[PDB]
Amino acid sequence: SAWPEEKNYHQPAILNSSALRQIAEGTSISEMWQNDLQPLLIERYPGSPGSYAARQHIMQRIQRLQADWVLEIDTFLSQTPEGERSFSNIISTLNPTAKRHLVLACHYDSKYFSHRVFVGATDSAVPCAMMLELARALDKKLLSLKTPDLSLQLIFFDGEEAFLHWSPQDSLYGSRHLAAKMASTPHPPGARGTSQLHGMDLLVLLDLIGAPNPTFPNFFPNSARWFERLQAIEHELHELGLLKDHSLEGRYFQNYSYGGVIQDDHIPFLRRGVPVLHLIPSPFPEVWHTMDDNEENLDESTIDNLNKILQVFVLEYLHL
């Protein structure tokens, strides 16, 4: 039937001032930092001990929550410039059999560099922490989903980074795999025509977050009305005095276009028709692909602000 089009007419349920205050109070940037971010600041390129530890960390942090998250590990083999490697996407789903999910994603691998070590704080340890912080902060509300046909999913992609220099064949290992897999998988089971890709309302991909004064442009016409929601949320939170070290002149969400094409985990989803809201700034952080992409260079207030915005957005999307 026509359920794959419901995404196109889906509206937010907009939060009042007293609700926005409650969400602002319910996230803890220091707990994220201590409990979510710090354990991820390790070398975690595919097959390294760090990759296994990051993966166990993300799963433990998720399982400890009340909401009925279902984890799945999507593990596969691929040739690389270094020889064959194993890769493990982490998918964490509420209500797997619901036709529709809002999808938040990042990558949890770190790009390999020869020796100081590269731990890619903004790239993408912070995105990971933010997702885990969202799950934690919204737990009580997300628990209410264990009872339209729409829920939430988190994807932590492996193998986003090139091993050598970026090419079509050396990058996006995990996202190219999972997109192809979802494209061939009936959803709901027993349905004709419709895939798991049909079920993805919107893919919200966080990447390179945590540098000061980020500017996210409005990359895609087909997510522009959700981008406008992010601008609105930032604007109301500011006016309500719920953001820190934030100016309307220095706002994160700015309605301008972007000139090129960014390659990232959304690419295999976008080319098959999935709507993408790509929360990657332009320019990239100053420390991009640098040993200085580290904890010290992160802006805690900025990240805390983005947490508030993203959490409101997600509640508003899911009607919670």
Numbering used by the authors: 34 to 148, 152 to 183, 189 to 361
What does the article say, verbatim?
Glutaminyl-peptide cyclotransferases (QCs) convert the N-terminal glutamine or glutamate residues of protein and peptide substrates into pyroglutamate (pE) by releasing ammonia or a water molecule. The N-terminal pE modification protects peptides/proteins against proteolytic degradation by amino- or exopeptidases, increasing their stability. Indeed, its crystal structure revealed that a Zn(II) ion bound in a tetrahedral coordination to Asp159, Glu202, His330, and to a water molecule. All X-ray crystallography experiments were performed using the hQC double mutant Y115E-Y117E (hQC-2X), formerly validated by us as a soluble protein variant exploitable for drug discovery purposes.
The crystal structure of apo-hQC-2X was determined to be 1.96 Å resolution, in the monoclinic space group C2. The crystal asymmetric unit (ASU) contains three independent molecules that are almost identical within experimental errors (pairwise root-mean-square deviation, RMSD, values of 0.11–0.14 Å). The tertiary structure of hQC-2X, having the mixed α/β hydrolase fold with an open sandwich topology, is not affected by the removal of the functional metal cofactor. Indeed, the structural comparison between apo-hQC-2X and the holo-enzyme shows no meaningful difference, as indicated by RMDS values ranging from 0.21 Å to 0.24 Å. This evidence suggests that the binding of the metal cofactor, although critical for the catalytic function, is not necessary for the enzyme to acquire the proper folding. Upon removal of the metal ion, a water molecule, WatC, populates the cofactor binding pocket in all three subunits composing the ASU. WatC donates two H-bonds to Asp159 and Glu202 and receives from His330 and a further water molecule (Wat2), placed inside the catalytic cavity and bound to Trp329. On the opposite wall, the indole moiety of Trp207 is rotated inside the catalytic cavity, contributing to the cone-shaped active site. The crystal structure of apo-hQC underlines the robustness of the hQC active site cavity that maintains its structure even without the metal ion. On the other hand, this scarcely flexible cavity indicates quite strict requirements for molecules that can be hosted as either substrates or inhibitors.
